[PDB]
């Protein structure tokens, strides 16, 4: 029902990187979220049955060629659930002549690997009164200048208790979730009629992948459960916004592809996931694509915002 939330930015030398540890302590449990921009933006989610679990970070090992074991939650015997979510690629499709709801949504351009981005230092963004921080980035190699005045931002917010923000999309949170907002702002598309998207990968349980469980889109709710509750989950509305003020008229559909079992080798390499889990090959990946071929788009103001919740336990009953 309520949790005491601590947030720390954890730094090292050499080769400083953005690492954010959110620790939400209940009466007999802790939820740990470890967010990082070392490699593609990733979060490691760990649920423990003690109010005293701790995160250990070995920075030199985390930055080495074999980082397995560099991140740990201790004691290991207290871990009830652990998994990860990785944002691997920023996708772009030319939708000229495509139909709404097509798969793929358009003719794909070469995706931007989010492992090849550089990021601002998150220390400055950390806002302890709002329990938030953000990771803002752009490609390291941008020969076309597409991000000369553009960035992709991942804003993370934790919660101490249940509530429903006033700002659209007004997802109901509990103390068992973080909210993530992803915003693409001011980057140049590579042609007209571009639809943007994100490739998302989760760490699966066994060989096979869960399905998305599904009123205008602003009152709809999609949910992905890692396993039967209590367990990891993500929830979002199938809407994104193409204007910063998120006027209803700026709403765009957010379509999710089916989840595909995916090998590590088909995704950008994550040192964070490998540090916590060792070498693993059971990922589940899907593409989220924003917008239709006509109507509002990223093309209006070069703005796209999408929000989701990520949590452990029972999902918020958002009804």
């Amino acid at each position, epitope marked *: 029902e309520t949790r005491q939330v601590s947030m720390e930015v954890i730094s090292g030398w050499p080769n400083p990187q953005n690492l954010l540890h959110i620790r939400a302590v209940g009466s007999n449990s802790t939820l740990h979220y470890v967010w990082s921009s070392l490699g593609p933006p990733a979060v490691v989610l760990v649920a423990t049955n003690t109010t005293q679990s701790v995160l250990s970070v070995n920075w030199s090992l985390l930055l*080495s060629p074999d980082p397995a074991g560099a991140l740990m939650v201790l004691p290991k015997s207290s871990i009830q659930f652990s998994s990860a979510l990785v944002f691997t690629r920023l996708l772009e499709f030319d939708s000229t002549n495509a139909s709404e709801g097509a798969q793929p949504p358009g003719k794909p351009y070469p995706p931007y690997s989010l492992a090849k981005f550089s990021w601002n230092n998150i220390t400055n963004s950390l806002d302890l009164a709002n329990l938030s921080a953000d990771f803002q980035g752009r490609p390291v190699d941008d020969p076309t200048g597409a991000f000369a005045n553009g960035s992709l931002t991942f804003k993370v917010q934790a919660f101490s208790r249940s509530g429903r923000p006033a700002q659209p999309p007004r997802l109901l949170h509990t103390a068992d979730v973080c909210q993530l907002e992803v915003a693409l702002v001011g980057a140049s598309p590579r042609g007209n009629h571009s639809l943007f998207g994100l490739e998302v990968a989760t760490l699966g349980q066994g060989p096979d992948c869960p399905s998305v469980n599904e009123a205008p889109a602003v009152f709809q709710l999609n949910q992905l459960l890692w396993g039967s509750s209590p367990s990891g989950f993500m929830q979002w509305r199938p809407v994104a916004f193409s204007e910063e003020e998120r006027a209803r008229e700026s709403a765009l559909p957010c379509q999710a592809s089916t989840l595909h079992s995916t090998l590590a080798s088909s995704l950008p390499h994550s040192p964070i996931v*490998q540090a916590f889990f060792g*070498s693993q090959n059971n990922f589940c990946a899907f593409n989220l694509t924003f917008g239709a071929p006509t109507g509002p788009g990223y093309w209006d103001q070069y703005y796209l915002c999408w929000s989701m919740l990520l949590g452990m336990g029972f999902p918020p009953v958002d009804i």
Partner: antibody
Framework: QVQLQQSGDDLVKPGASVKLSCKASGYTVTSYWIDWIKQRPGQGLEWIGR????????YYNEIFKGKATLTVDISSSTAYIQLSSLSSEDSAVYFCAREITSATAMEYWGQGTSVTVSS | DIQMTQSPASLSASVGETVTITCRTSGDIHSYLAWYQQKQGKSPQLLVY???TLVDGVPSRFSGSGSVTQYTLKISSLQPEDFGNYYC?????????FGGGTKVEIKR
């Protein structure tokens, strides 16, 4: 307790097909991938492919696409490989193996089934 | 694909000696690499996975290490029962091929 029990050694005619089986027991069959591996007499190991028993999702080595077809019967916890259009190069021992949880090794192996292609 | 070169193809050593088998890959495989031993007339048995993790029950004289493109199996204090064929296998981009093998012979 984890066991993979493979079908008996076989003689098969050139150009016919043969279906080999591997019955898994001692664990929940849908929680792990199953792979097939080929070994010609005196030679090294060749990876054929893998199958996820819950979904029948497969990966194949391109060398065996159209030679080999993987299937599973979940109710009987049995993996099958069908080898079609057989020739002498197909004479070999075929192993089934279960992947480890992380899907980054083959931990439990069956005993192998020898196939000889001859008239 | 990933190309793998396992070397040497054969080695001969005496009981009590320490020997090494190397597997070099064409690209970084991030420790997605296993080692097997195969004895005459038997199935292969997994010795080490994820480059360096020893399987429970496997004698501690076997060890693996490596990263990036260079992986090594070490057998300390070689015993007569170590005779046989050894194979690396990667689990990076499919196909998940095997090294060409190393035959270990025992001098006596």
């Amino acid at each position: 307790q984890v066991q993979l029990q493979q079908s008996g050694d076989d003689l098969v005619k050139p150009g016919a097909s043969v279906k080999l089986s591997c019955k898994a027991s001692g664990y929940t069959v849908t929680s792990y991938w199953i792979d097939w591996i080929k070994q010609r007499p005196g030679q090294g190991l060749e990876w054929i492919g893998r199958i996820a028993p819950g979904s029948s999702n497969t990966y194949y080595n391109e060398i065996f696409k159209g030679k080999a077809t993987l299937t599973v019967d979940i109710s009987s916890s049995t993996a099958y490989i069908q080898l079609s259009s057989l020739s002498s190069e197909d004479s070999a021992v075929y192993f089934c193996a279960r992947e480890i949880t992380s899907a980054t090794a083959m931990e439990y192996w069956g005993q192998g089934t020898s196939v000889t292609v001859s008239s | 694909d990933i190309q793998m070169t396992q070397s040497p193809a054969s080695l001969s050593a005496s009981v009590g000696e320490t020997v090494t088998i190397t597997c070099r890959t064409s690209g970084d495989i991030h420790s997605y690499l296993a080692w097997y031993q195969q004895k005459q007339g038997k199935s292969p048995q997994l010795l080490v996975y994820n480059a360096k993790t020893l399987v429970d029950g496997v004698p501690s004289r076997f060890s693996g290490s490596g990263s990036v493109t260079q992986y090594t199996l070490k057998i300390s204090s070689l015993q007569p029962e170590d005779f046989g064929n050894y194979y690396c296998q990667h689990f990076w981009t499919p196909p998940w091929t095997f090294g060409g093998g190393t035959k270990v012979e025992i001098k006596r």
